[PDB]
Ligand binder design. Structure first.
Ligand SMILES: [Ca+2]
Ligand SMILES: [Ca+2]
Ligand SMILES: [Ca+2]
Ligand SMILES: [Ca+2]
Ligand SMILES: [Ca+2]
Ligand SMILES: [Ca+2]
Ligand SMILES: [Ca+2]
Ligand SMILES: [Ca+2]
Ligand SMILES: [Ca+2]
Ligand SMILES: [Ca+2]
Ligand SMILES: [Ca+2]
Lengths: 181, 183
């Protein structure tokens, strides 16, 4: 391994859910996104960002309806252009090892399309339309979002706080997760 | 390849979601588990089971908290010891090609631990405890199970029918589905 110093690999393992072997694999994925831009020596702490377009188009994200928001939220400046640090943070949260309540924390940030710390009916409608791939009628999307609010809006102000949202997820385990390899 | 007749491979391609070639390669995986137990000629339909202990050690299952229940449900006799047909059926349902409505049916079967056709509060507790993998306290699991029942139990008999379970899954979006990305 000639990319990082021992210390900086220990730090990545300390601040993500990944093993050293996983950090190395993901580094090479990141470098391969923009091979004429990303250097192969990170021991000098280069300041490098891969443009959003080359992140969102990667195989693991290109079909995710929230790829732009995901990259924005994890990017250093909120514009989707990502350092290696940002990239590893993103995939650490997306990994199998991340607790569900932690995924729910970042999902809130991603679905809060206007970054006002609430998921309102408009944020919900955008989210549900995206999640459902545009196959529901705008009229039916709106009705689904009404249902979610009636269930989860604990203080009846018509919108979901972070706590509203995380507790909704907590009460809804992923019963179909068993039947996947 | 002298493992199967043309008609056997056609029947497997029909009933599973796999191609003939994928069936052959799944056979290699089954035979690999117990290579002096599983014969190479299946044209006579030999009666052979691979023990649960070998099934549950597969990578597809060894880290799945429900591996015992999965093997039990797909096994011919409910003990986790699997014929080739059981093995193919299991992988077919677990495959990406399997419709979500079919995965939901088998999820219900697996979570119905005592096979009495309902998910009661005890089944649900065992299920949610396994799905949350220690992330929740026992107290939190109980509170979640009571909520799940209260919201999904259509006829308020205190248990989930297959209809109740199906409607629950259909009722709301998986808000975290877009946050499971392996690399
Ligand atoms: Ca390439
Ligand atoms: Ca908002
Ligand atoms: Ca609220
Ligand atoms: Ca078929
Ligand atoms: Ca072997
Ligand atoms: Ca039962
Ligand atoms: Ca699990
Ligand atoms: Ca009730
Ligand atoms: Ca309700
Ligand atoms: Ca019921
Ligand atoms: Ca009652």
């Amino acid at each position: 391994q000639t990319v990082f110093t021992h210390e900086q690999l220990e730090a990545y393992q300390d601040c993500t859910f990944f093993t050293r072997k996983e950090i190395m694999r993901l580094f090479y994925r990141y470098q391969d996104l923009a091979p004429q831009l990303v250097p192969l020596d990170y021991t000098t702490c280069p300041d490098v960002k891969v443009p959003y377009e080359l992140i969102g188009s990667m195989p693991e994200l290109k079909d995710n309806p929230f790829r732009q928001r995901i990259a924005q939220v994890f990017s250093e400046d909120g514009d989707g252009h990502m350092t290696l640090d940002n990239f590893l943070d993103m995939f650490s949260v997306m990994s199998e090892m991340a607790p569900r309540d932690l995924k729910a924390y970042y999902a809130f940030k991603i679905y809060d399309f206007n970054n006002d710390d609430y998921i309102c009916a408009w944020d919900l409608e955008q989210t549900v339309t995206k999640l459902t791939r545009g196959e529901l009628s705008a009229e039916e999307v709106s009705l689904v979002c009404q249902h979610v609010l009636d269930e989860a809006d604990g203080d009846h102000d018509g919108r979901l706080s972070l706590e509203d949202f995380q507790n909704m997820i907590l009460r809804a385990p992923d019963f179909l997760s068993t039947f996947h390899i």
